[PDB]
């Protein structure tokens, strides 16, 4: 292979690299369009070491206190039914509808596996809203309270529009702690510096920066707390030992200093900057996603193109067939036009291949012992009633008497081809039952004399062996210039080995891409093997592909020359 | 430039159409003449008798005396591969030099399809060619002068709907027959082998047959695929003649020689 | 085309530095 071959590949499966390339790309605009954008929010941490206090802030001591200051664990979501319901919402211009609950105790279900009940909250108007658990419906205002059912609920400040539903999910104080501590991250920007670049993700851009507030906050007020609480259990043992008198006023001058130590130890921490949130979303990354998308899909299509390539064993071109020794005596191409094609668009590109198949027959036809052509192949729908119905009706234009015999006795339809009278066709004429006169039939609009196949007999091999089917041969042999006779292909049925015997000349019907080279040349080996002489090959069915340009010097296909009026 | 350079480089790795005569020589096809382009309805070969494709052409009238003796008849069928590859522009214009040379000369349009041959030359387009073959004119009526000429032609008449089935009726043998004993040489022109049949149902009466190649628009493998086409229909065709030449650099450096030829004039 | 884009520099005196630069990148 070179770079003409691959190009010419390329250009060929054109349509289906385009396709799988547009389906991935497809993909990933819809993925990175329709995922929810995660933002960040950030704050800066100034440490007076910082390696401490990066496990403090990380701690579920700190962050279980930021989940009771905002009741992170009451988890509440907009309903969207499918997985897509939330992004294409948020491309329509609808603005999430949120409620702000302030006290929320669920029936705590707590079964084997679902540790986190929930409820389905649906908006019936700005004020009153109704509650679904597990089908109890259930009516709530804002404002008051709702303890019914073992359920307590306090929902502040409905902002949404009626007939949108929220699960509102109580998930347990650690599983609000480990979301949190997954989305929440400490750096220290220095290495040395008592800088701590505090930052925290989430879908919510206002909420995420509240709670990275409140871990600062925390972490803020806690950590004053910790140095005074050396002093303060000092202290607080004092407190529990205060009852000679000299010793009890040596003990009050301690009471006070643990007083005033604790209440001014404040430090180690300073809060530069606080929470805010970058409004650019960092995720989804819709640059580096589609790009990806395009990458990953030509990525793809090529190797499935160049799979295509590797694995296909069929003819590309009559010269696959000539390195073998196969004479090709035309190829035919895809006809895009129960009618003859010959005679419905005798100006088709196909006919005009077959009329250089009838001149280039012409000279090889001569020099045969009789004037009977048979056309056969290796497999079936390779174009041998095409070819040889068509090749009929270019030689009966031309003048000559041409009689078109349907000995495919198995499948033959050159019957409803030409118009029939059923009766009387080629089989009641092998089994006896009808005479040489009866089962001949003209064509309407060809200009030639036909033979059908009759009805399907129960022995078609061993019906062309009789002595009638060469006496027929004989007979028509005097009354027409040509003979054509249509066979089953000979990968299939030996029916064409036994009447190739009574044909001066046989060609072969190759499919262009459906047919191997080898399912040919053991074709031509099983007629010679029969004592049938396999004149050449005719190629059908060919198509224009850039690859055979590349490959060959020539696909092979023809060319149109009318004066286009 | 790296753009630039790899367009280049893909254009050359790309391109299949013939270079040189030397490519088709090396599968054994007589190569008669290269023609240029000539960047000058007229005949070359009247309008402008000093061009440089004239020049070549004459080379191509002196190669042919030499190669169509010793042949059946004195009919040279001209055809080719693909369209537009130069069969009339080479045919019309080599009968007009062989005209010169005091001879009689008969050029027959046997294009059928898209001939325009007597739009060439100027016509009374009515009893062409397929208005003898198909019965309804004699053979004294189809034959024109070419005014600017010097040989006489056959034009193709009306578009007929069987052109290649009136090429097989006995009346074109006739024609060719006839004329064979009335001219010194009769050039027939084609329509091209790999869009119909109808040159290889004429070139059974031609004693010579060319292929004309297009530069770079024909393939080696399109010509020897004509040339096999051809014999397979008991037509031989004697040679090839490339046509459309352009000065390249690149066959100079890949061959010895670009083939376009040299102007010689004494400039006044 | 391009707009052309200047530079101006300034210069810092530091009685360190490392906590300095972040400070002074500080949204206060
Ligand atoms: N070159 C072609 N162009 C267009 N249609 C074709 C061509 N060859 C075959 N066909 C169509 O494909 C089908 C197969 O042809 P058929 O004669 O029934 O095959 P076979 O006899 O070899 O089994 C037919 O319907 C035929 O019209
Ligand atoms: N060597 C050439 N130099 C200049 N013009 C040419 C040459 N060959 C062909 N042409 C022009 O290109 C067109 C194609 O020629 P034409 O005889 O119609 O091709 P064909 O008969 O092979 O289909 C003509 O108009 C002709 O004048
Ligand atoms: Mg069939
Ligand atoms: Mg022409």
Redesign the interface.
């Given at each position: 292979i070179?770079?003409?071959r691959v190009?010419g590949e390329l250009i060929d499966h054109r349509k289906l690299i385009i396709s799988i390339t547009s389906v991935f790309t497809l993909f990933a605009i819809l993925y990175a369009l329709l995922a929810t954008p995660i933002y960040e929010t950030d704050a800066?941490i100034?440490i007076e070491q910082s390696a401490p206090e990066t496990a403090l802030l990380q701690s579920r001591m700190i962050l279980g206190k930021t989940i009771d200051d905002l009741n992170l664990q009451i988890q509440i979501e907009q309903k969207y039914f499918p997985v897509i319901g939330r992004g294409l919402a948020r491309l329509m211009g609808e603005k999430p509808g949120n409620i702000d609950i302030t006290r929320l105790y669920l029936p705590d279900s707590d079964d084997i596996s679902n540790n986190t009940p929930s409820i389905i909250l649906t908006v019936k108007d700005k004020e009153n809203y109704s509650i679904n658990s597990d089908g109890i419906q259930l009516n709530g205002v804002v404002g008051t309270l709702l303890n019914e059912k073992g359920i307590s609920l306090l929902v502040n400040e409905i902002d949404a529009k009626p007939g949108d539903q929220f699960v509102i999910t109580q998930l347990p104080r650690l599983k609000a702690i480990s979301d949190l501590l997954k989305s929440f991250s400490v750096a220290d920007?220095?290495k040395?510096?008592?800088?701590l670049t505090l930052t925290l993700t989430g879908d919510n851009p206002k909420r995420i920066s509240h709670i990275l507030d409140s871990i600062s906050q925390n972490y803020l007020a806690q950590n004053i707390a910790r140095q005074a609480a050396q002093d303060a259990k000092s202290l607080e043992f004092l407190n529990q030992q205060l009852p000679g008198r000299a010793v009890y006023l040596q003990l009050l001058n301690r009471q006070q200093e643990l007083n005033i130590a604790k209440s001014s130890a404040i430090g180690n921490v300073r809060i530069?900057?606080n929470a805010?949130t970058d409004p650019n979303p960092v995720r989804p990354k819709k640059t580096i996603i589609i790009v990806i998308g395009v990458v990953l899909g030509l990525i793809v299509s090529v190797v499935l193109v160049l799979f295509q390539v590797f694995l296909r064993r069929g003819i590309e071109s009559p010269?696959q067939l000539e390195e073998i020794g196969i004479?090709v005596?035309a190829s035919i191409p895809i006809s895009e036009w129960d009618t003859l094609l010959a005679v419905g668009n005798?100006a088709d590109l196909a006919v005009?291949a077959i009329?250089?198949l009838?001149?280039?027959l012409?000279?090889?036809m001569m020099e045969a012992k009789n004037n009977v052509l048979m056309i056969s192949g290796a497999s079936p729908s390779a174009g041998m009633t095409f070819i040889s119905s068509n090749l009929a009706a270019t030689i009966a234009?031309?003048g000559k008497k041409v009689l078109f015999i349907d000995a495919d006795l198995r499948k033959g339809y050159a019957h409803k081809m030409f118009g029939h009278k059923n009766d009387k066709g080629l089989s009641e004429f092998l089994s006896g039952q009808a005479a040489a006169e009866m089962i001949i039939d003209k064509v309407e609009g060809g200009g030639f004399d036909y033979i059908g196949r009759g009805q399907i007999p129960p022995n078609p091999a061993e019906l062309l062996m009789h002595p009638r089917f060469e006496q027929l041969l004989n007979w028509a042999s005097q009354n027409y210039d040509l003979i054509i006779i249509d066979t089953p292909p000979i990968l299939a049925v030996t029916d064409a080995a036994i009447i190739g015997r009574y044909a001066g000349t046989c060609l072969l019907v190759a499919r262009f891409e459906k047919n191997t080279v080898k399912e040919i040349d053991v074709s031509m080996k099983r007629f010679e093997q029969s004592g049938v002489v396999v004149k050449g090959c005719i190629l059908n069915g060919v198509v224009k592909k850039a690859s055979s340009?590349?490959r060959?010097?020539?696909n092979?296909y023809?060319?149109?020359?009318?004066?286009k009026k």
């Open positions: 070179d770079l003409g190009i800066l100034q920007l220095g040395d510096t008592g800088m530069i900057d805010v010269e004479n005596y005798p005009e009329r250089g009838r001149t280039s012409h000279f090889a234009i031309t340009y590349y060959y010097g020539h092979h023809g060319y149109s020359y009318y004066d």
